Amino acid sequence: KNRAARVRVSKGDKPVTYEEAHAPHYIAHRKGWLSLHTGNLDGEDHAAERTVEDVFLRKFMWGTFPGCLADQLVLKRRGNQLEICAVVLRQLSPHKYYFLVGYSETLLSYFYKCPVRLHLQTVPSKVVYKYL
Amino acid sequence: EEVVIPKKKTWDKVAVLQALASTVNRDTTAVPYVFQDDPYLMPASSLESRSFLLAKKSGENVAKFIINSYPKYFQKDIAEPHIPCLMPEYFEPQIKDISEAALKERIELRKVKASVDMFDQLLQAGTTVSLETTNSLLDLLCYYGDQEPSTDYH
Amino acid sequence: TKEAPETDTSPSLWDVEFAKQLATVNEQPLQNGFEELIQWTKEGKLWEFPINNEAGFDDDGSEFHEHIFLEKHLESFPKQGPIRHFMELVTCGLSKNPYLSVKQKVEHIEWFRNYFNEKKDILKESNIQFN
Amino acid sequence: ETYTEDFIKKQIEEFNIGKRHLANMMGEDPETFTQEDIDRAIAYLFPSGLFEKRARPVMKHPEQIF
Amino acid sequence: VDVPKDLTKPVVTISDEPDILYKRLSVLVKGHDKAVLDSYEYFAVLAAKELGISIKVHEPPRKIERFTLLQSVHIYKKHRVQYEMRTLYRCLELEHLTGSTADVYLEYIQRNLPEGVAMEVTKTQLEQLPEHIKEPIW
Amino acid sequence: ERPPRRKALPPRTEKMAVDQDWPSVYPVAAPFKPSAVPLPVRMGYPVKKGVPMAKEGNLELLKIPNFLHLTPVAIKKHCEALKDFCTEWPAALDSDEKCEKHFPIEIDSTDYVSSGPSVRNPRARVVVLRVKLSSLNLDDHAKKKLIKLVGERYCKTTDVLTIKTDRCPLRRQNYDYAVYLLTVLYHESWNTEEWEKSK
Amino acid sequence: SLSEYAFRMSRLSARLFGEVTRPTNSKSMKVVKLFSELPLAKKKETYDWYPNHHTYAELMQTLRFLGLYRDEHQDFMDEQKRLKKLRGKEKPKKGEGKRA
Amino acid sequence: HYVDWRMWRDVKRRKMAYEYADERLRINSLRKNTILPKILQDVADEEIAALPRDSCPVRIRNRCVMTSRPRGVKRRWRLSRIVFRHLADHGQLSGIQRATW
Ligand SMILES: [Mg+2]
């Protein structure tokens, strides 16, 4: 039996989001890619450095906003710009969100030497696609 | 037969962006652009407006404090063209010799206490300090009232 | 007004500080997205469009003839013989190299000038005259 | 999920109001904007390459969706 | 009611140097997603028409790169997972442009290049014979 | 907890008029914000007896590279502001044949737009120079000598000499080299050497 | 297998286009290939193959000690290491170990 | 802080090889031809053999940058087949999908 990135049926009480409810064979049929850059296009360079950056950014944001992220990040690259789109929860105070946005945007711009923006979308609770 | 080639048109690097910016007007339904465009994060009062920006500025200062405290972590330059503004800043004097030329650095760094102490040491050693260098020290001392300029943290 | 200002004279701390206050009166928060892009462009953070892949990189303002014609540097070497032939192959490769600066290509040639100078005794045993 | 009749009625009002914004965005007449123009506009504004068309962004009348 | 009375327009200065002449610009764009290339084409064609540029669009054939990997961490060689990367193309061919026009159009469309889409702009430049070649010196 | 939890304001799409200036809402490329886009757009493969997911917290809509900042109204307004930067193509050069007569040489260069921190691309340095040998003042001997010197760079069918240069780090250096090669080829072709009598 | 005219025209073209002019065998032509490209060790793919794991590890360790990064993994191994001290499975002193 | 001591040894080899690349290129050119005298080429043979062993480029190994796996690595991403699949199957690699045809 295949295992890769499959949430397995339980007793019908496990809430899954739309992203985690779709197995890998749907990545270009029902769900899209969580990162969009040019590295993996034909004749394009630096796929390796883009990949390492994505892995770091996903871990940095998970620990920088502990318990706030409601779903996976969407990493966007346009030219020199890096745009991080995060769906967060409405539990942490707004003051603390603004502090962390100013802190993460500055710290990441100096680390990867590019203009970095963080776009937060707040949800009251995790969006449940189905109960498995 | 002769063909007339048009004269070239030259503009600044930001001119095209400024032309596109003129076409749009302020969106009345939105709060100022500096704020996060989200119902939960949008400021809902005049006080929140000030505090939300102050929190964002505090975050930026904390990041800058870390960047300058640990330059090593932000010294890998992968940008082309190189971006000077996104590199760490070094505020400490790198010339440790006691000389007039080494003193000029501390005045450029605006180290009021270091410069005065070094100027005194230089004078005690008996080496010559140029009038221009002494005048530069007075400018630094007179402007700041013989007090250290504010810094991020000690 | 004054016919010629003291442009060569550097500004004093007071002049620098006063110029920073004149910036503050006009300082406002970014008003829209276009303004953010304009600020980054002026700061040098954002790329300048249309995209030029050599933006900010010039190979020390070297000319094409400096890269391609490197025989000027071979003058210290023998005009004829095996060393000349070998070096002609070295410079031919270097002339076809777009990844090296002119300074780096000269370093390669300079290293050979020293190596053969150290091995002159061996070269004389092989009936090769260097310098 | 059960969709009561009042909920459907609120969804219809939203479609009609949204339909007028979509015509305003695309610079067309709100009064002759058809469902085939809506689909063309949504395809341009929200380009999705997902092979399955049922996974692509849709803006249909609530009567055809629910 | 709160409308700016006057607007500062960006300064464009006509220089005293002759402008470059472009016989053709071939703006090839690569993307994993076809719908995104369709939207970009509609943008770039509409922009060209409003600026007076002559634009012809054609779709070069797509390229699919496939490679195979082992499915299990250890042994079970017969079982493989196969991955692919699809690169779709759209070639926007401008014609009879000038250096200034090309600069404006290219900046406008390149700034609006969507994430995950690359570009290769081949610029054919009309030139005149060098002065040295006009006649032989020997 | 002194007060109740902070309550999110209603979305500002409820304040938007149906005749607003939309380009003012999305002036530049930005991520899809469900609170700012006044469209009941749904996305997501529907569950059995279900409907595509709503836009709030919808990660699929966030993954799309939207064109909300490039509506037909915005594009026409944008281009009206950019007409001042354009110069007029010479009316004389109506056809390609007219271009070739007045401008025989064609220089091809390529620019590569990729996403990342570095703009550098080693393919951008290549310069291609094309010139038809009929546009050059070549006699019979010179034309024959040139075709022999260049080799496969010359195409008999089109009568075009293609000189590709990629030796130097920069495109400007490769352009100067291509022009230089054409110059020495022209003059060397005209020069007649004594050993040419052994043909 | 070339005429005198063909040979001398080929040598002129080689001089014009910057190619090897003297007669050179295939073995010695390697010198031209060696200096026309970067050595494999000098290519950015080679010497910058790995990410600087020191920078990442040290940065994220400092940010944890500063209170700005929560390392769930490091928290997990700090609780385990704490429960092993109460259980008596503590790391011994270096040099003064069980053996001697 | 590298994944293991093996990765750390490869990191040092890549560094030393980079430092000696020019010197090794120059000496090899002396050896890789029939023009120069064999006496000179013999001295060059000894000189390149006396350089530190870890400067030899053939000793570098393309290990997975995340897990240090020495085999099964895809050179374009520098990732092992197990780590690459983990990122691809979660939709975190731009444009990479499962192939069916
Ligand atoms: Mg199976």
Ligand SMILES: [Mg+2]
């Ligand atoms: Mg090996």
